[PDB]
Amino acid sequence: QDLYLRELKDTKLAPSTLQDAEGNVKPWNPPQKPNLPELELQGPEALKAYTEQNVETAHVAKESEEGESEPIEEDWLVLDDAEETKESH
């Protein structure tokens, strides 16, 4: 009946321009467009960090080297220190 149809029609006048269409909004003085799709579109990345973890910064892992590939000055010293330990061992 009509009293539901007219409020169903009312759903096709007041909120039809709200989200069903993009005719901004008549009852509201503040606009609907420059909040969610431009200011709050970056809103999720205005809550998290930008240009570091949304870009995600796929960074090359810092490379770690061996013991400088210099065995002679330490292996014999370790061998000399191994003599010291095994006397105490």
Added chain:
Amino acid sequence: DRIDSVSQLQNVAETTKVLFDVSKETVELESEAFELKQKVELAHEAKAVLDS
């Protein structure tokens, strides 16, 4: 007494070679998943942003 002392390491030194060998790899073979760590952490932020 020196019979026992010598016999303490009769079998040790040659068996410490494979010990010294394998210990070297088991220590310094942790780089492949270190790079996987780089992509695993890459996955978490990828999940994090989309969850965000």
